[PDB]
Amino acid sequence: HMEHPSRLRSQHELARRYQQNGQVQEAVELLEQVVAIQAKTLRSEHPSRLASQHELARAYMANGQVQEAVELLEQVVAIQAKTLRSEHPSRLASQHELARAYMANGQVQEAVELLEQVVAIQAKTLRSEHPSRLASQHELARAYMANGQVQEAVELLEQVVAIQAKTLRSEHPSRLASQHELARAYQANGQRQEAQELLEQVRAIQAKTQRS
Template identity: 45%
Template sequence: TALAENHPNLLASRHQLAGAYLADEKAIVILKKVVEMYETLPEDHPGRLALQHVLACVNLRDGEPERAVAILEVVVRNAEALPEDRLNRLVSQDELARAYLNAGQVKKAVAMLEDVVRIRKAQPEDDMNRLSSQHYLACAYLAENVVEMMAKVVQKGPRRLVS
C-alpha cells in the first residue's frame, strides 16, 4: 500500500533522498516538496526546522544567500526557545551568519557570530564547532574592515587611486 503524502516515514525518506542529491539540482525540487509537506507541522517542530536548515544550506551553496537568509531567520527565531548553548541553535546561528556574510549584511553577521563565539567559549579550545565559529567571525571582521577601507578610498576620490 502507498503511504500518505504527509506520512512521517515518507517525509523522512524524501529528506534522506534530498540529502543524497545535494550535489544535484534534484535536491532543491525534492526539498521544496518535503518542506511544503512539513508546513502542516508547527513552525517550531524539530523536523521542520531541520529540513528548512538543509534547504537554506542548499540555497547558500547555490549562490542564493537572500533566500537562505529568509529561511534561516525563521529557523533561528524558532530556535530561540532552546537553551543558548544548544548545538542545533548554535549551528543555525552560524549558518545564518554565513548567509548574512554572503548577502553582504556584514554587521548582522558580526553581531551574531560574536554572540555565538561568546557562548562557545565554554567548549574545549580544539572543538571543531568552536573553531568554525571563530573562523567565520574572523572572516566577518575581515569583510567589515574591507568595506570600511573601500568606503574611505571612494570618499577620497578616484584621483588618489592613480597617483
C-alpha cells in the same frame, strides 16, 4: 503493495555507506526507488514519506544534483509548513537543509530567510551550546555574508561568542569554532586587524591544547 513501506527508512543507512565510499550515484538510485515505493502507499503528510524525501534530497546534494535537491526540499518544506508546528524538530531540520541547497544554488536571499526562522525558533527550543543550534547560527552568518549583510553576520557572531565567553571554557571546541567564524566575518567586514588578532588567539589555544 509491500506490507510496511514506512520501514524503508532502513535504506537511509545503506545510502550513507554508499556515499562514504564515493558511490554517491548509487545512493541516489537507492533512495529514488524508496521514494517511488512510498509515493504509492503513504500520504504526502506521512512523516516516513517526508523523511525519505529529505534523505533523497541530501543524496542529490552529495551527487551534485543541486537543482533536484532544491525542488524536492521545497516540496517537503511546503508540506511541513502546513502539517507541523514551527517548533517541530523535523520541520526545522528540513528548513536548514533547504537553506543549504539554496546556498549551493546561489539562492542566497531564500537561504537567509529560512535560516532566520530556524535560528529564531532554536533560540527557544535548544540550549546555546547545542550543536544544531550553533550550526544554524554559523550557517545564517555565512548566508548573511553572501547576501551583502556582512554587518549582520558580525553582530550575530559577536553575540554568540559573548555568550560562550560566559558558558564555555576557552579550550572548548565550539568556543574556538565560533571565534573562527567571527574572524571570517570580521575579515569580510574590513575589520582585518581584529580578525587576525582573533585568529591568533584561537591558534594559540589550539596549540596549547594539542601540542602542549
